[PDB]
Symmetry: D2
Subunit: 470 residues, 4 copies
């Protein structure tokens, strides 16, 4: 039961909009909206959506596997060894938000301070003493962005696993000699950094020039979660405000995906006429180039929606019915919809490119969709006893207790996968957790959980106090 | 009773090192060390100190007044109007950590998200609706560092007030015409940005080329807090670890100040021989150029301590008794003392240049000295009823209640000064508060509060949980 | 009779290597090597060649037409109007080395000082007084590289003409309104700068992703000059030194072109066994990325010559027989061939990327191939009377004489084409001429002209004197 | 007889403005204006002057000695050894336009291509074979501006000599160990680069914060050439055009110097009333910050001429009688005087900051003052036989002749000083010569030589032809 199985199971249910039914549903953690900072929904005038992994949640592990396969086949086609074709995606290895160290070829799970929580070289998990050889303070400098790459999105799960597969392969293959910073193959030296760049290039190629989109669109039921409740929620938002779409994707792909997401024999509710996806939006913007979008952006263009090509020239005209925009900046949306940032709730999945940048650069209100939460909640509850033990041990710690804390931390972590919870390693929160708490005003397993709250709901978080104020 | 009066009152007391006396003393908030993240003192192998506003706490308002006076006289000497000589420092206006907006000439108190809490143009406090003309989302982009300058240190209190005095002066003087971005004086236009730069240049000049240091050193009892307990604490730290000094100041000034701080007819305790200040340190480093120090640094130099001049050439030798270093990098300290970052507790007052940068760049443990805490605690306790009311109102808020929340927030804020608490405006925490909580492992009114805790004390903070984990 | 007709006519002749025949041949300007700075051929130890427009001279106007056609079809395919398909390359318009002004959409012919010699907006040649509206000092700032683009190579002849065709089209088409910096089409604005970028992108696409190379290789006799004397010259150079190839092209294309250039039923001379092209070179380097090549370069790679793919990893091994390199830097060649810069004569066609950068960055000796010289010499001689008149007029000028100087300048210029000689407009030398004289030690219509000089020839230029030294 | 002796001898003569006397005077090379590119004086509408080493020519070797002495005393005061006080300026060593190599500590005389003509380490002249160890291609990369510093001005003559004195001192002093990139003194390493930076800093300090200006102004007759013909020439220029002053100097110093330059008991000619220096200028601009002046410049300020301080604010008003400007850009002059660049003849001494940048950035007409020309002409003529021999030898060279060419080159060079002619080493022209020919339209020993030519004089240079055009 993957997180996307949980999501599709919930997707297959019709909405019971009886107000008592809604209150009862949102009791369940799965259907809840979690609150980092208070947000009065009556003050939101524009609801903004991202597409991929927000509206269009790709099914797991099928979509990751497909990405993995195509990225492997691209590497082989440019000259990587044929043994790469023996690799097979394993959803139990990667956790999102890991850092690849391009100097030493390690996947790292770190906290917000750059402290090491987990270190794996290939499939070899390095324990604390051994890690001190490469990380003498058990710490990385996060500002060293040329060395350390943060794998933020669900699109990065395939490369996360592939990176580990490659280090494992070259390490254990007798044709190569391992060195601290890469592999020697005769008179050829491949650094981890250049291997990393090849992988990153190959993922990019698969998305831009390869067959990922085509294979996705030819089997949408296999690859994409579909929910009859989507048009219902959007239709309700449009009753109280404006709705916009802002995607890094191109129009032709957006049209195919959004068409699919709205393909039911009805509109917002059963019995209602079907309406085109575009009718649900006051503004549609593709090729957004987030996060640059939230700074200078790019020139505003108009899509010719018949051909799917951009019209030539910068678009200088007003918001018109049926117009589809490309490029621009966050200021385009604000100006055309007449919103200030705090009037906007932007709903996305990319912690950096959607949430952190819209919050910090523009003061937008933010909702982070965390698809894995669906399953992480089930584990958090089913295994709460292990965490409770860990909490008690940590308290009792103010020895053999310390080795028990390590053992329990490991047993807890393993319940999530080889790289542990997205949110923590035992009692230490991850960088991803700290960025969620800091930048995501709201978060949930799915944006659809907003359907279960009334229009004027006040989401509340407790006021924060400093230690000297308590 | 300024914060420095509180600090000197505590300074005049001898240490009662009876273990029961110590436990009882550190009960009081004034004498307490506050904990943002847990820290096991037994793991600290090096204690590092900054000098100014850490070891050498300048008396208030006398030292700010002196800085103010000299900065005014420098501006007048370069051509500013004679009416500046009518200005007189007012300690009731500035709060630390304000942002000067160089485009519109406002002092702003903001939260961690760039949200406006207070906006003053000269001495005119702008209420929310009027602020929307210049700040349509009631928000600033903190990454716009060319526009917004954060006044982080107690050294910035004089310019904070002076900035306000100048905008007030030019606004109300009929020789000048006010414009949105500065003042017209015939065929001369002075932008707020160029005025700001003149002030910043004049403060720098006063410190580097003017008479501030000379006037300070000629009346140290007037300007500098002195505490017999300093050598006691340092002597105790040296029993369990190494002690270093890292200052942005030059050696000649450092020597005069540190000599004064240790000038008692005894050493660590009464009855003991006096020892030179330098004997308390394993490493002394001046001209540190923090925060660059925590990145590339500068070339390591050796001070000729007889002349106070640098020896010519980069110093390539070992740590030797009596050597005094200049420049270098944080890696100099680590290498010469054989420490990794987590073995170091660095004690400073500059939230950015001491604490944030040593934490983020090097994974040092951090202790922030907040001199105003001495007095902010007295107000926090004496006026807790106003905050309690505010908390209750906010709860009751889930109208005339909303105007009561504004009124109570104001009455609370005014107890601290015209720009409110360093840490908050009513229930909204400031940027400075959020940076203290994030980057300062420990904090206190004075580093001396460490004397009241044993060598192997475990400072504990509660583990943090996400909303879905609670 | 295009310049390439002249070149192929000379190419079809067998080499008469009788020493008296050689001396007599190189009398003719067409077969001569011209000398800007003295060069002792006996000191040259390595001869380096570029491929395109050096060894492989593309036939004119056929190859330019093909590039033009494909670039047009790419623009149409991305959304440019169908009327572009009515354009047809005209070899009589463009001269090499023009500057496109992206702000005002003009093609400019300038001198070394940025002084305007010719200005055309579309096909409208702007006379001096009108040009002062846009160029008040009749001058451009050459350091404004974001505004001004120099069209240096024969590869740029198609876009030179296309730029003019486009400005002409949009200016005279009633669907568009002309503005100073581009064209309005309703709510779309297309700036000259964005049009220019579209053209540049489309040329790049044609070369990298389109069909130019494929269509070239399927009719090499149509598109490429072939000369039986090439292997003879290279074979002779290899007798006295080392020979290398350095191309910006990829290996697969290089192999197809070089195979063709050497496809005769003999080797160096008639009667000799044919040898593969690669046997003529001590070092072969593709994907050179000139001019970056002459600075940091890129990582040195090894080509797998069976597949045409790069081997994975940086190549760290020695120069080996049969190895083909990719990337690297000019230092690669020096190190592997054991040459210092002054031991190298590098033969190329790109005034900036081959000649200026190798001279300035590395102190290489330089030979510039100027394919149009073949025909420019015929005009220079056939019409010397017009220039002679101009010279006399200029002398007599120290009025109606001044209008005669303009008239004669024009009549002279028109003999070369609408944009005049590559080297001058009347008596004013072009930027391209000044760069040839400054950076090209030697130059000629073809590198083959080196066959007509002995191994130890001393090419001499007169020593230069300052005005006060004469 | 220094060049400044020659200049003052000519300065002491009254102007005979009889038209036949003028024609005859300008026959002599000393009194001639030399022409690199033709210039019609009737088209010049604005004459622009620099002050230092243009209008105010400092006497040699007295002024260089003074600069040298003060720079030495500054180095000693910051900690350099006392033996520096034994140094004494020697005018026979430095030639202008040398390059200091900060990596290896050599003074280099180079051509326009970075080819080595002379290399001295301290006072040791390194002959060709030995130089190949450090300069394997006998070449430097001029674009490596962090490594190579060009000593362009007469202000750089003292540091040129001092650099050589220092390398000599540390090399031969047994306290220091010489290394390839600097000197070891125990645990101190001083790199040539850091020594160079100390010298550059000390020269800057002497000019900005030391006593150079004060000592100059207290003995102007000792340090500054004065010429009664200056007001005559300026008065004549003002009859046919506008006259401006643009100096990097401050107003107070400019006023003292310009007052002195005009201090005669008469105005333009004997018998005429004396007029203040400022009356000779339509525009006076100080603190020009050339060459930044010819790009973005700085904010335009107004000088308060009573106090010598800048008025506060950017000056936004018109050109007014008596106004003195500070900062700004070259566009300030153009706009306020209503000139385009080709209407301006700018007269200066700094080949880079005055001449090259005004030519390339703005298309100004340029006149370079070369004070040493006064004496270099006397040597060029007196020793023409040596050059003639060299020319003949070079011809005869197309061996013992080659060693004769080296010997004659040396004997010729030594007539100018240890570092040879400014303009050449034997038959090879220097970088400075090539920049003079390229960027200086006109040049002369003194700007005063313009007095000897009529208002509408056409300065002519021969049209340049390429080798294939001859
Ligand atoms: N999740 C992420 N993915 C990619 N880049 C990131 C992410 N988070 C931060 N960055 C960027 O990485 C760079 C270095 O991060 P650094 O730790 O110095 O800053 P920070 O994110 O502000 O740290 P903190 O989380 O302590 O506020 C910055 O440019 C930052 O914007
Ligand atoms: N006389 C000088 N003094 C200081 N800087 C100079 C001088 N002449 C050129 N430069 C600068 O030095 C840098 C490197 O010079 P480089 O040889 O690459 O360019 P260049 O001067 O254009 O050469 P060329 O003389 O061949 O035209 C450039 O930024 C250039 O402007
Ligand atoms: O790593 C990547 N390389 C290239 N494209 C990516 C990558 N990750 C996501 N994308 C693309 O980004 C788009 C998702 O944009 P979204 O709708 O804004 O979430 C899709 O078109 C993806 O193909
Ligand atoms: O704004 C400033 N301008 C110039 N110097 C400053 C400023 N603020 C602090 N300083 C100097 O910084 C030094 C303080 O360094 P610390 O010991 O590292 O805290 C003192 O020498 C101050 O004079
Ligand atoms: O404008 C261009 N855009 C893209 N490729 C170009 C352009 N001009 C030349 N080239 C390519 O550069 C290569 C020529 O390299 P050369 O052998 O070094 O002259 C050929 O592969 C061309 O296709
Ligand atoms: O190397 C230097 N360092 C500092 N000032 C210099 C240097 N060289 C020249 N100057 C100053 O530049 C000014 C000369 O400007 P000019 O009138 O534009 O030639 C004088 O004030 C000099 O003091
Ligand atoms: Mg997304
Ligand atoms: Mg401090
Ligand atoms: Mg080429
Ligand atoms: Mg000067």
């Amino acid at each position: 039961t993957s997180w996307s199985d949980r999501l599709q199971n919930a997707a297959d249910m019709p909405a019971n909009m009886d107000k008592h039914a809604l209150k009862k549903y949102r009791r369940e953690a799965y259907h809840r909206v979690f609150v980092n900072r208070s947000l009065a929904m009556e003050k939101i005038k524009c609801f903004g959506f991202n597409m991929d992994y927000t509206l269009a949640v790709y099914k797991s592990p099928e979509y990751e596997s497909l990405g993995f396969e195509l990225t492997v086949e691209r590497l082989v086609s440019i000259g990587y060894p044929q043994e790469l074709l023996s690799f097979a995606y394993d959803s139990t290895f990667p956790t999102r938000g890991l850092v690849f160290d391009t100097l030493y070829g390690n996947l790292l799970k770190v906290d917000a301070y750059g402290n090491l929580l987990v270190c794996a070289h290939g499939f070899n998990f390095i324990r604390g003493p051994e890690t001190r050889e490469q990380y003498p303070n058990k710490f990385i400098q996060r500002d060293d962005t040329e060395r350390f790459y943060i794998l933020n999105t669900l699109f990065n799960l395939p490369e996360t696993y592939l990176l580990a597969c490659l280090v494992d392969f070259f390490t254990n293959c007798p044709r190569y000699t391992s060195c601290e910073t890469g592999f020697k193959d005769g008179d050829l030296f491949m650094s981890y950094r250049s291997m990393f760049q090849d992988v990153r290039d190959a993922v990019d190629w698969v998305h831009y020039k390869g067959s990922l989109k085509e294979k996705t669109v030819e089997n949408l039921e296999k690859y994409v979660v579909k929910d009859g409740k989507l048009p219902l929620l959007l239709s309700r938002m449009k009753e109280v405000g404006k709705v916009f779409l802002a995607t890094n994707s191109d129009y032709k792909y957006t049209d195919k995906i959004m068409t699919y997401l709205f393909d039911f024999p009805h509109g917002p509710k059963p019995g209602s006429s079907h309406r085109p996806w575009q009718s649900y939006f006051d503004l549609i913007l593709v090729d957004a180039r987030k996060p640059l979008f939230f700074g200078e952006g790019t020139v505003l263009r108009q899509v010719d929606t018949k051909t799917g090509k951009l019209k030539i020239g910068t678009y200088t005209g007003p918001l018109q019915h049926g117009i589809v925009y490309s490029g621009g900046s966050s200021d385009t949306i604000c100006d055309l919809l007449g919103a200030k940032g705090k009037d906007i709730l932007y709903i996305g999945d990319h912690i950096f490119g959607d949430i952190l940048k819209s919050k910090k650069r523009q003061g937008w209100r933010t909702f982070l969709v965390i698809p894995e939460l669906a399953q992480e909640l089930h584990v958090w509850t089913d295994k709460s006893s292990l965490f409770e033990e860990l909490q008690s041990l940590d308290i009792f710690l103010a020895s053999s207790i310390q080795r028990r804390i390590k053992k329990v931390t490991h047993d807890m972590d393993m319940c999530y996968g080889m790289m542990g919870s997205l949110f923590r390693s035992g009692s230490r929160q991850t960088l991803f957790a700290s960025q969620v708490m800091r930048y995501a005003d709201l978060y949930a397993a799915s944006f659809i959980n907003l359907l279960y709250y009334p229009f004027s709901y006040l989401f509340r978080a407790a006021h924060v106090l400093m230690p000297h104020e308590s």
